[PDB]
Design a protein around this ligand. Structure first.
Ligand SMILES: CC(C)CN(C[C@@H](O)[C@H](Cc1ccccc1)NC(=O)O[C@H]1C[C@H]2CO[C@H]3O[C@@H]1C[C@@H]23)S(=O)(=O)c1ccc2nc(NC(C)C)oc2c1
Ligand SMILES: [Cl-]
Ligand SMILES: [Cl-]
Ligand code: NA
Lengths: 99, 99
C-alpha cells in the first residue's frame, strides 16, 4: 500500500499468535513492543528516546507479521508507550519513504 | 525521491535561517527541533516518548524547507536528542510510506 500521514500509520501486527496495533516508525532504528512473553533467551539493551534512556529486553529471530507481511527479526520488549515497528523490520517488509 | 530505510532517513532542513539535519519520522506526530531561537509568540508544552516527557516551546506558523520542499506548521523547540520532522510537516511535502 501507499500510506499517507494525515493520521498515525497504525497497522495490525501478529506476534506469538496475538494481534496488536503498532506504529510504523521511520524514526525508530529498532522495533519496541509493550511487555509480553516471548520465547528464548534475551540480552540487555539501552535505548534513548526523546525523554531519555530505558532498558529493554532484546529477543532475536522472532516471527512477526506486520500489516500482512512476514518478518523474522529482533524485537525489543519494554515500557514503550506505543508499539513501534522500526527500520529493522520496515526494511524486511520492503517499506520506503516517498515524496 | 524514494528513501530506503537501511539507514536513518536524514535530510537537510532550513529553519529560522539555519541549516540543520533532521530525521523524517513517521512515528512523530509533531516536529521537534533542538534548542534555537524562532521569532514570534510561543507557549509551553510537554511531549512524551520513550524515556518520558520533555518540556518544549510551541511556535505556530513557522516555515521550514525540508529537502527542498517548503512547508508551514507548528514547530516544537526543546531538548530533543535529534531534530525530528513529524507528520504535521511530512504531510505538507506529500510524504508517504510505501510497501
Ligand atoms: C516513540 C514514538 C512513539 C514517538 N517519538 C518519535 C520516534 O520516531 C523517536 C524519534 C527519536 C527521538 C529521540 C532519539 C532518537 C529518535 N524514536 C525513538 O525514540 O527511537 C529511539 C528509541 C529506540 C527505538 O529504536 C531505536 O531508535 C532510538 C533508540 C532505539 S518521539 O521522538 O518520542 C516524539 C516525537 C514527536 C512528538 N509529537 C508528539 N506530540 C504528542 C503530544 C501528540 O509526541 C511526540 C513524540
Ligand atoms: Cl501544524
Ligand atoms: Cl495527500
Ligand atoms: Na508564530
Amino acid at each position: 500500500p501507499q500510506i499517507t500521514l494525515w493520521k498515525r500509520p497504525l497497522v495490525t501486527i501478529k506476534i506469538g499468535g496475538q494481534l496488536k496495533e503498532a506504529l510504523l516508525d521511520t524514526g525508530a532504528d529498532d522495533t519496541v513492543i509493550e511487555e509480553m512473553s516471548l520465547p528464548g533467551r534475551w540480552k540487555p539493551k539501552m535505548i534513548g528516546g526523546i525523554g531519555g534512556f530505558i532498558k529493554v529486553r532484546q529477543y532475536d529471530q522472532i516471527i512477526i507479521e506486520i500489516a500482512g507481511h512476514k518478518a523474522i527479526g529482533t524485537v525489543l520488549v519494554g515500557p514503550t508507550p506505543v508499539n513501534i515497528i522500526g527500520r529493522n523490520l520496515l526494511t524486511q517488509i520492503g517499506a520506503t519513504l516517498n515524496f
